[PDB]
Amino acid sequence: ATIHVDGKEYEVNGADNLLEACLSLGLDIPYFCWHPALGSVGACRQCAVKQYQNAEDTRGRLVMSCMTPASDGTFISIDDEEAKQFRESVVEWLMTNHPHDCPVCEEGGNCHLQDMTVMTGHSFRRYRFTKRTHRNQDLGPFISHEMNRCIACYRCVRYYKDYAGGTDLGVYGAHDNVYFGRPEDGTLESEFSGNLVEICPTGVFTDKTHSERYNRKWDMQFAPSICQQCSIGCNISPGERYGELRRIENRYNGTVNHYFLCDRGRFGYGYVNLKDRPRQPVQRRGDDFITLNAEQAMQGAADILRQSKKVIGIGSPRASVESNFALRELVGEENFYTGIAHGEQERLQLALKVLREGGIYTPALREIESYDAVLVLGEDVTQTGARVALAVRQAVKGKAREMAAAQKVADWQIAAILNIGQRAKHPLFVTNVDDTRLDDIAAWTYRAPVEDQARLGFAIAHALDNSAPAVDGIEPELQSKIDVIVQALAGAKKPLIISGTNAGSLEVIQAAANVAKALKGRGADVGITMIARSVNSMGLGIMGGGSLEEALTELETGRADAVVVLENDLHRHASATRVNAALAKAPLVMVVDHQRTAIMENAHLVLSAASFAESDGTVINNEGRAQRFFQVYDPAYYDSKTVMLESWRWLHSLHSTLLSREVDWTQLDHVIDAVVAKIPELAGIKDAAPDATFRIRGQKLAREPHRYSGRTAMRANISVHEPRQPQDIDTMFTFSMEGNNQPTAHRSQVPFAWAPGWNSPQAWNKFQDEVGGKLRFGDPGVRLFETSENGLDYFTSVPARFQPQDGKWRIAPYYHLFGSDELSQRAPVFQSRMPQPYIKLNPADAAKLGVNAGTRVSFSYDGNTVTLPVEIAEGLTAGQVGLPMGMSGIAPVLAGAHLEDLKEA
């Protein structure tokens, strides 16, 4: 297609509309109601251009560029005087009722409405009458509501309802009293409600957690990082000010998480700002806790570790690849233990074997949206891998997309698409121990124990391919529903099988692998997704090591007299009594961590590690993508006595002091080279980001914007002498604005989006090759493994049906987006959002116990009696008891275990 804008010829995509085609060319057209992920609706009337019939036409006609196709031989003008006057008039109409709020508005300096007001050149007010005002609502702890600032662009309702699937946000009212909010006060119920703060072009929906400690966008220090709160690896831009992590912005990655995060990743960052974190090395001597600097901490630790006979190291899936590798090098390969339990490790290694040996392509998160049928087995995706659930919602709406494409309706005309595809949708079959948040769009939901979910998967695989092992004892009605699933999956051009390790069942993963193999054998373009538990679960699985039970065995038998625990609380993966006994028996415990955990009371030495905000490293996605996170700020810039080093730096210098009695604060690139030299299946992590010598025409990449303020006053209360700018030897980023952040710079790591004239999140348009596409020079991150040439064999270990045995209670895992992740549930704003700990019971089991809804029952696990109030779960099955995983006292390792002595307290 060829378009002519203002007499200049451009070659565009004819399937695009004119607004996105012209924004992809670098032309500036103001817009409000259009979003690249939401489509065109033509509400705000801001994007007007002048379209001419042909080259020899001068009159023309004002058209909405978002609603106009970029067809071949199109003639438009943006800088036409009539078009400019109309766009300025639209801005003026929006300005008539807008409140005088910019100094006390959290959107200021980050506001799309401010940018478009300046861009149209409207700065003179001639409206003299009153302004309409609105009451605000309480939307919960995360989103602050300020309805006066609304321009009625309908982006919030289109995102929250049509895109995200939420039900409790809407538009109410009429002519000019349109109200965007909830029907009543209350917490917004969607797991993706936090994206409203970037979807809303004004300051109606604002980050309340940021608003408590507000600072402007130009005052932030940003870095490109990876969210640490689950395994999806969404790209984030954490920004800090005055030594504390202030905000998490979405960092655009066209391959992973393009515009959206979930609320856990957006709002669970508050554990970084906790005041009980270790900020200096501490050695316990007697009852005293002597504070050390880095040098003498390394010397004393090296002396005690040299005096010991065997040293073991316990890693964590929280820690990065470099940190776990450094611990593995310090203690030796045979003495290194993954910090997760044996069953967790077995399920994780099986998921890895399916991903990198099953011969079936594992999609990226953006690619999930293009699949034609989804089967989810055992994985409560919305509570464990939430952005996969959002992508699955888009994949389900793909059927309405196809039906509208059959009637020659353009891809961006979203309202016509939703009108054609009324309630038709692609098949979704979810399986869980209870109801999920995907049940509203699921074609079928199977609520069953994990044995029965695995049996359903094996039966589906056998019905698709008779070479798969058969299942004996399927009821005829369940068989009919299985046949419905098989007809939906066999007719799909791109079926997608999603499972994961959060079900606590190996057989569920085996059944999902069998279904994916059966669909692969029929010629389908099948994909398989595995949801792991933690940010670097897949990296820890690739690195390998013994289980936590083997490490505790070594500590309890006395074969190991020194243990180094890296970023692991050890109570989420084993019983707390056994961990406490093993750590009390060991004469040397050294905890390298950034959070105050319960095992530090047994620790002889505590090394104050850095969090993701204060460290660099590599983490491995649930799809096997290696991604770097870069340090946001120097922790010692404000508090000079803070000794908070990276975990790989601590462990590498400790290894160097153990060998040659000299400390060695290494560089990140050296550790990455060591990883790719010693572990060949982690060799892809070298290409995740360029090394520290990378430059854009000789200069580094800036962490903070050009207008960063307070350079000679922010530390002036400590000392009037401005300190040295902190030097970053690990990465290509600088701790200053003396660097490059151009949208046209040849790089993939973008710390934050800013363009002149574009201060809002809409500045990401300048950083993309096409708007809503990829980044201009490729998205960051690299897949570690390719699709295998040959797949696996069928798993023949079909489990038996679940049998409720008296006295025992199978623990059904219930996951929560706010509470199940360890560090995020340590964040203070999650405590208001955290549900009360309820033990979930079947009505029949509660009637057998005599227990009603709300009475407190006591149950003993590992000889420890704990008491919880009862919530009746109708979707649960008899003989199972539902427990909230990862909460206070309930470890996620309890999933699949049995329970004893359940009685009323």
Partner 1 sequence: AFELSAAEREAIEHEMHHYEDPRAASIEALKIVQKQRGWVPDGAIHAIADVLGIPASDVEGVATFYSQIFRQPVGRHVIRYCDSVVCHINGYQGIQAALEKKLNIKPGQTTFDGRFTLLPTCCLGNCDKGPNMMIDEDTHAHLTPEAIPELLERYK
Partner 2 sequence: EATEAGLLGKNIMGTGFDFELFVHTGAGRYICGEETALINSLEGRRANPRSKPPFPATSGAWGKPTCVNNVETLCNVPAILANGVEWYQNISKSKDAGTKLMGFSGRVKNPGLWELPFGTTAREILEDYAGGMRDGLKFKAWQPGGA
Binding partner of residue 200 among ligand SF4, partner 1, ligand FES, none, CB cut-off 5 to 8 Å per kind: ligand SF4
Q: Which two tokens stand for residue 443?
A: 């074609």
Which distant-in-sequence residues (6+ apart) come within 8 Å of 748 by Cβ? Answer: 689, 775, 777, 778, 779, 780
Least distance to ligand FES, CB of residue 19, Å: 6
Using CB under 6 A, which of 31, 648, 818, 830 touches ligand FES?
Answer: 31
Is residue 450 close enough to count as binding ligand SF4 by CB under 6 A?
Answer: no
Using CB under 6 A, which of 22, 262, 450, 468 touches ligand SF4?
Answer: 262
Sign, Cα dihedral of 193, 194, 195, 201: positive
Is residue 203 close enough to count as binding ligand SF4 by CB under 6 A?
Answer: yes
Using CB under 6 A, which of 35, 134, 155, 715 touches ligand SF4?
Answer: 155
Is residue 47 close enough to count as binding ligand FES by CB under 6 A?
Answer: yes
Using CB under 6 A, which of 3, 22, 32, 489 touches ligand FES?
Answer: 32
- Per-residue CA distances from 417 to 155, 420, 422 (Å): 17, 5, 9
Using CB under 6 A, which of 200, 456, 574, 763 touches ligand SF4?
Answer: 200
Least distance to ligand SF4, CB of residue 886, Å: 13
Is residue 66 close enough to count as binding ligand FES by CB under 6 A?
Answer: yes
Binding partner of residue 42 among partner 2, ligand SF4, partner 1, none, CB cut-off 5 to 8 Å per kind: partner 2
Give alpha helix (H) positions in 491-637: 506-521, 537-543, 548-557, 576-585
Cα-to-chain-centroid distance, residue 30: 31
Which distant-in-sequence residues (6+ apart) come within 8 Å of 165 by Cβ? Answer: 190, 393, 440, 441
Residues in region 174-193 near partner 1 by CB under 8 A: 174, 179, 182-184
Q: Which two tokens stand for residue 376?
A: 């989810």
Using CB under 8 A, which of 12, 23, 27, 67 touches partner 2?
Answer: 67
Is residue 416 close enough to count as binding partner 2 by CB under 8 A?
Answer: yes
d(C-alpha 557, C-alpha 585), whole Å: 9
Binding partner of residue 199 among Ca ion, partner 2, partner 1, none, CB cut-off 5 to 8 Å per kind: none
Binding partner of residue 264 among partner 2, ligand SF4, ligand FES, none, CB cut-off 5 to 8 Å per kind: ligand SF4
The neighbouring-strand residues paired with 530 are 499
Burial code (b: 16+ CB inside 10 Å, e: under 16) for 70-101 equals: beeebbbbbebeebbebbbebbbebbebbbee
Give the pairing type, strands 880-884 and 809-814.
parallel
d(C-alpha 202, C-alpha 111), whole Å: 6
Nearer to ligand SF4, 68 or 760 (CB): 760
Segment contacting partner 2 (CB under 8 A): 248-256, 412-420, 812-820, 849-857?
412-420
d(C-alpha 107, C-alpha 492), whole Å: 44
Segment contacting ligand SF4 (CB under 6 A): 257-265, 538-546, 652-660, 742-750?
257-265
Binding partner of residue 152 among partner 1, partner 2, ligand SF4, none, CB cut-off 5 to 8 Å per kind: ligand SF4
**What's the CA angle centered on 845, arms 842 and 847, to 5 degrees?**
105
Q: Which of 135, 150, 136 is nearest to 99 (CA)?
A: 150
Sign, Cα dihedral of 434, 438, 441, 445: negative
Nearer to ligand SF4, 258 or 520 (CB): 258
Binding partner of residue 586 among partner 2, partner 1, Ca ion, none, CB cut-off 5 to 8 Å per kind: none
Is residue 208 close enough to count as binding ligand SF4 by CB under 6 A?
Answer: no
d(C-alpha 495, C-alpha 101), whole Å: 50
**What's the CA angle centered on 888, arms 883 and 893, to 5 degrees?**
55
Q: Counting beta carbons within 10 angstroms of the beta carbon of residue 42, is it exposed (0 to 12), middle (13 to 18) or buried (19 or more)? A: middle
Least distance to ligand FES, CB of residue 90, Å: 9
Residues in region 136-175 near ligand FES by CB under 6 A: none
Is residue 383 close enough to count as binding partner 2 by CB under 8 A?
Answer: no
Is residue 42 close enough to count as binding partner 2 by CB under 8 A?
Answer: yes
Least distance to partner 2, CB of residue 419, Å: 6
d(C-alpha 380, C-alpha 498), whole Å: 10
Binding partner of residue 101 among ligand SF4, ligand FES, Ca ion, none, CB cut-off 5 to 8 Å per kind: ligand SF4
The neighbouring-strand residues paired with 857 are 868, 904
Least distance to Ca ion, CB of residue 226, Å: 15
State the residue number with the nearest CB to ligand FES. 66
d(C-alpha 88, C-alpha 95), whole Å: 10
Is residue 317 close enough to count as binding ligand SF4 by CB under 6 A?
Answer: no
Segment contacting ligand SF4 (CB under 6 A): 71-79, 231-239, 715-723, 858-866?
231-239
Which residues are at the interface with Ca ion (CB under 5 A)?
616, 631, 730
Using CB under 6 A, which of 35, 87, 251, 387 touches ligand SF4?
Answer: 387
Q: How far apart are the first and last CA of the chain?
A: 74
Nearer to partner 1, 169 or 292 (CB): 169
Binding partner of residue 521 among Ca ion, partner 1, partner 2, none, CB cut-off 5 to 8 Å per kind: none
Q: Which of 101, 104, 29, 111 is nearest to 67 (CA)?
A: 29
Cα torsion 819, 824, 827, 833 to 10°: value is: -40
Binding partner of residue 31 among Ca ion, partner 1, ligand FES, none, CB cut-off 5 to 8 Å per kind: ligand FES
Please answer whether residues 338 and 566 qualify as being in contact, where contact means their C-beta atoms are separated by less than 8 angstroms: no
d(C-alpha 99, C-alpha 109), whole Å: 16
Is residue 818 close enough to count as binding ligand FES by CB under 6 A?
Answer: no
Binding partner of residue 409 among ligand SF4, partner 1, partner 2, none, CB cut-off 5 to 8 Å per kind: partner 2
Is residue 227 close enough to count as binding ligand SF4 by CB under 6 A?
Answer: yes
Using CB under 6 A, which of 3, 83, 143, 156 touches ligand SF4?
Answer: 156
Please answer whether residues 352 and 541 qualify as being in contact, where contact means their C-beta atoms are separated by less than 8 angstroms: yes
Residues in region 156-185 near partner 2 by CB under 8 A: 171, 174
Is residue 833 close enough to count as binding ligand SF4 by CB under 6 A?
Answer: no
Using CB under 8 A, which of 420, 606, 775, 893 touches partner 2?
Answer: 420
Is residue 25 close enough to count as binding partner 2 by CB under 8 A?
Answer: no
Is residue 46 close enough to count as binding ligand FES by CB under 6 A?
Answer: yes
Phi, psi at 368, each rounded to 5°: -60, -30
Using CB under 6 A, which of 3, 12, 27, 152 touches ligand SF4?
Answer: 152
d(C-alpha 439, C-alpha 396), whole Å: 12
Question: How many chain residues interact with partner 2 (CB under 8 A)?
Answer: 14
* Helix or strand run (H / E) with residue 478: helix 476-490
Give the pairing type, strands 428-432 and 373-377.
parallel
Is residue 180 close enough to count as binding ligand SF4 by CB under 6 A?
Answer: yes
Using CB under 6 A, which of 41, 91, 150, 566 touches ligand SF4?
Answer: 150
Residues in region 68-127 near ligand SF4 by CB under 6 A: 98-99, 101-102, 105, 107-108, 111, 113-114
Least distance to partner 2, CB of residue 98, Å: 23
Q: Residue 238 corresponds to which amino acid? A: P
Residue by residue, what is the 3-state secondary structure of 168-202? Answer: CCEEECCCCCCEEECCCCCCCCCCCHHHHHHHCCC
Using CB under 8 A, which of 85, 123, 136, 167 touches partner 1?
Answer: 167
Nearer to ligand SF4, 76 or 531 (CB): 531
* Binding stretches for ligand FES (CB under 6 A): 19, 31-34, 42-47, 64, 66
* Binding stretches for partner 2 (CB under 8 A): 41-42, 67, 171, 174, 407, 409, 413, 415-416, 419-422
